[PDB]
Design a protein around this nucleic acid. Structure first.
Ligand code: MG
Ligand code: MG
Ligand code: MG
Ligand code: MG
Ligand code: MG
Ligand code: MG
Ligand code: MG
Ligand code: MG
Ligand code: MG
Ligand code: MG
Ligand code: MG
Ligand code: MG
Ligand code: MG
Ligand code: MG
Ligand code: MG
Ligand code: MG
Ligand code: MG
Ligand code: MG
Ligand code: MG
Ligand code: ZN
Lengths: 209, 142, 16, 59, 38, 176
RNA sequence: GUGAAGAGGGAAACAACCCAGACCGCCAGCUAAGGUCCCAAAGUCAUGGUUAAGUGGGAAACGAUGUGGGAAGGCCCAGAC
RNA sequence: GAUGUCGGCUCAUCACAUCCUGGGGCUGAAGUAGGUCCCAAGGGUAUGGCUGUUCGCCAUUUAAAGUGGUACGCGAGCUGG
RNA sequence: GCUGAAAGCAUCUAAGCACGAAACUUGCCCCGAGAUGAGUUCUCCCUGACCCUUUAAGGGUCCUGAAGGAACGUUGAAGAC
């Protein structure tokens, strides 16, 4: 099934009458407007392109403005595509609200993880540190050996090394839906989701089920 | 006088269409390689591409003898330490039929820049339809 | 081993 | 190079290089391969005549 | 199953059969007599 | 050889249509069809069918013997048919036929429901007996084997789904 | 005997193996070992056989109704197996 | 006219003659639990006491605490008993 | 295992048909058209004159400067640059 584009508002909790505190992530899901419908005949695959939010008119380029004008919708902050499931039909200009998740139970949330910059092997790959004392010379958090000897004579591809950590697309699966509030355009899911406050999120019905 | 040399700017190339239905893989490939290189022409020059354009149709119906449908294995390494991958002839035909013919012909063409240029003149199709009617290919029973 | 018995008590060449 | 060109031109006339050379020998034709390759490219009519002579000798 | 290099009939009910490219001994009377060359 | 040389007498009321290698036998019980090996030459003469080797094939006679045996069974199938009987033993082992699905209780924690093929029909005279009817000899044998597979006769007491004629060899429990 | 103190062709590559001993030049011809479907020069040559294992294209004692050929012999229309 | 040694630490990678988990045949296999052979390399596969030790013995775990190759892997990565 | 000859019987196999494992190909997650075989879809922008020579995917002059980009500035839960 199709999903919706939302925004990470932050985390809080929901106290139940039983006395259980549920950690929840608040996702603001405003109306998603269909901008284009892909069909097998013209594009070779079935999908819908949606936009959400608003954008300053002075920031919309003429190429982008023309695209929105054909659909007849106001400009949003971006464009996202969702693959259709054959039994699903949508029209250009249609608005989809958070009511889609009324009876979904479990969702998969995709977002961009927080960026950690250049990370070492201890942090990036959970490498063990060498001895802090007992003679160690300038080698407390260094990687150690990176290969064997002459037989290979090289380092193998995929060797875990220091480098950029974070700032990448991540999907968390099978998150329980706690509350769907159409009036407030809100979706509450149990647990933490990737990204910082204010980041764009992609919510879809759970695939594993 | 000096021996004649073909000029890459004045070479005349023709278009042909071949049907691969029920033809032995290897024996078909040798003929394709000959004509792609241009060994069938009196103007053959080893350093000039003097061959012809060949369209191969029905690549999925090519034949092999013996038990090679289930026993011929295609190997490739991805570059990562383990990375040794294998695929049988039947599996290749199911996933990407064109590859089978392309792989065979490539192994029979000269290696190097000129050989790669010769390979570009081969157009392999899994089905019975091609879109090169404008080039007016001539039927070649080979 | 090749180079044993000590060299520079460990630093090799020394002098410097 | 000359041999390869003669082979191609002969097969266009319906005979292999090996048989073509044998036929010329049996017909006492002493043209060498350098000249044969030149004729094969520049004078295709004359090359056809050579092939016919070779075929007649082999018969 | 007895996997051996030398497979042979062990009783009168033992039969030698070649399934695929493997010589096998199948016995109706005794299950202990079942053998495969390998 | 000997099997192939014997002709198959097609009885009255059975129509044999030979189209190339594809031969169809239609009778009162049903209609069966199959395509024969290229090395087999089948000729319909009078009320009999003659099977011979086709020139240019090494196996030849071997294939003809197979085709003859198969053809014979098809004729028998479309007239009288075939019957396979299975008996349940073990205390608590019961079977029931609901339409085309056979429900078996073989002492498992879950129910076993076996779906029957298109041409096979089953009946349970008692709770411990299953009789299969059909026109195809191969199919009826396959179904019987599938039912038997669920609980194969054990070697200590004989409990399980067994063929009616099958004799089950039993052994003693070690010693003392 | 060759290398050492010898080049050239073959053996994928490969002093010492096979063929063969480089005075210089030639866009001429014939051959040796080894080869002639394509990479890659020359037979998708001819006739008669064998193999189904990719054997060919690595390995023994031993095991086997694989299959081709040959000379015997018990046995068999008193109907054999 | 230099290829630095044993053990430890860090970091590994492959083979399968498989230690655990998966599939199966025979059993002198009632069940539970075993013996033995076949298939299978996806993942997984202890912490301490003593000794420089590898190893080994011992204590207590674990589904299991596999066997080998990699300059007896790894000092222009560490230590230096 | 089913049916089934060669080999009147047997026989899972030779023709034909069915089951069968964490291995294999998928299904799940991430990268990915420099995939030079450089793909597809949607939208936006530019609608002027003259000369010269070796006469052609030719050179030059004047007018024109679009869509968009970059630069600069205030910066970021983005970042060594
Ligand atoms: Mg120190
Ligand atoms: Mg120091
Ligand atoms: Mg320090
Ligand atoms: Mg080369
Ligand atoms: Mg000397
Ligand atoms: Mg040499
Ligand atoms: Mg050489
Ligand atoms: Mg001399
Ligand atoms: Mg000669
Ligand atoms: Mg050639
Ligand atoms: Mg021939
Ligand atoms: Mg020295
Ligand atoms: Mg030196
Ligand atoms: Mg093994
Ligand atoms: Mg897998
Ligand atoms: Mg070492
Ligand atoms: Mg070093
Ligand atoms: Mg010290
Ligand atoms: Mg010391
Ligand atoms: Zn026996």
């Amino acid at each position: 099934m199709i999903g919706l584009v939302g925004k990470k508002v932050g985390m809080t909790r929901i106290f139940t009458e039983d006395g259980v505190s549920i950690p929840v992530t608040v996702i603001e899901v405003e109306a998603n407007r269909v901008t284009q419908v892909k069909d097998l005949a013209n594009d070779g695959y079935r999908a819908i392109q949606v936009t959400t939010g608003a954008k300053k008119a002075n920031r919309v380029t003429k190429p982008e403005a023309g695209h929105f004008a054909k659909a007849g919708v106001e400009a949003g902050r971006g464009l996202w595509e969702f693959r259709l499931a054959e039994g699903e039909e949508f029209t250009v200009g249609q608005s989809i609200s958070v009511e889609l998740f009324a009876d979904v139970k479990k969702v998969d949330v995709t977002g961009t993880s927080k960026g950690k910059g250049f990370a070492g092997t201890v942090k990036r790959w959970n490498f063990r540190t060498q001895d802090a004392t007992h003679g160690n010379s300038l080698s407390h958090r260094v990687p150690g050996s990176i290969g064997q000897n002459q037989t290979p004579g090289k380092v193998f591809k995929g060797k875990k090394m220091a480098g950029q950590m974070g700032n990448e697309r991540v999907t968390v699966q099978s998150l329980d839906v706690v509350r769907v509030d159409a009036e407030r355009n809100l979706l509450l899911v149990k647990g933490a989701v990737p990204g910082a406050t204010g980041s764009d999120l992609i919510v879809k019905p759970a695939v594993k089920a | 006088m000096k021996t004649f040399t073909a000029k890459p700017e004045t070479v005349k190339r023709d278009w042909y269409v071949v049907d691969a239905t029920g033809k032995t893989l290897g024996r078909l490939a040798t003929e394709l390689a000959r004509r792609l290189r241009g060994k069938h022409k009196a103007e053959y020059t080893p350093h000039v591409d003097t061959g012809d354009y060949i369209i191969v149709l029905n690549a999925d119906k090519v034949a092999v003898t013996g038990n090679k449908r289930t026993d011929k294995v295609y190997y490739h390494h991805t570059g990562h330490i383990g990375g040794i991958k294998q695929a049988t002839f039947e599996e290749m035909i199911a996933r990407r039929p064109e590859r089978v013919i392309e792989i065979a012909v490539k192994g029979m063409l000269p290696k190097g820049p000129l050989g790669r240029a010769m390979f570009r003149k081969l157009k392999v199709y899994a089905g019975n339809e091609h879109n090169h009617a404008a080039q007016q290919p001539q039927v070649l029973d080979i | 081993x090749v180079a044993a018995x000590x060299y520079x008590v460990x630093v090799x060449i020394x002098x410097x | 190079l000359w041999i390869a060109r003669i082979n191609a031109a002969a097969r266009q006339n319906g005979i292999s290089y090996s048989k073509f050379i044998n036929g010329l020998k049996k017909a006492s034709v002493e043209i060498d391969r350098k000249i044969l390759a030149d004729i094969a490219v520049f004078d295709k009519v004359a090359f056809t005549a050579l092939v016919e002579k070779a075929k007649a000798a082999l018969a | 199953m007895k996997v051996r290099a030398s497979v042979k009939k062990l009783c009168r009910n033992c039969k030698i059969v070649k399934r695929d490219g493997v010589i096998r001994v199948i016995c109706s009377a005794e299950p202990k007599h079942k053998q495969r060359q390998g | 050889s000997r099997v192939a040389k014997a002709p198959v007498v097609v009885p009255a009321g059975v129509d044999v249509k030979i189209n190339g290698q594809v031969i169809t036998i239609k009778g009162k019980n049903g209609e069966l069809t199959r395509t024969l090996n290229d090395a087999v030459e089948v000729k319909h003469a009078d009320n009999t069918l003659t099977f011979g080797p086709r020139d240019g094939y090494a196996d030849g006679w071997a294939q003809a013997g197979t085709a003859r045996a198969l053809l014979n069974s098809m004729v028998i199938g479309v007239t009288e048919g075939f019957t396979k009987k299975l008996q349940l033993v073990g205390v608590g082992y019961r079977a029931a036929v609901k339409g085309n699905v056979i429900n078996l209780s073989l002492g498992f924690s879950h129910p076993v429901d076996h779906q029957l093929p298109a041409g096979i029909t089953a009946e349970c005279p008692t709770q411990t007996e299953i009789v299969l009817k059909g026109a195809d000899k191969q199919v009826i044998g396959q179904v019987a084997a599938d039912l038997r597979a669920y609980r194969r006769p054990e070697p200590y007491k004989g409990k399980g789904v067994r063929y009616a004629d099958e004799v089950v060899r039993t052994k003693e429990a070690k010693k003392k």
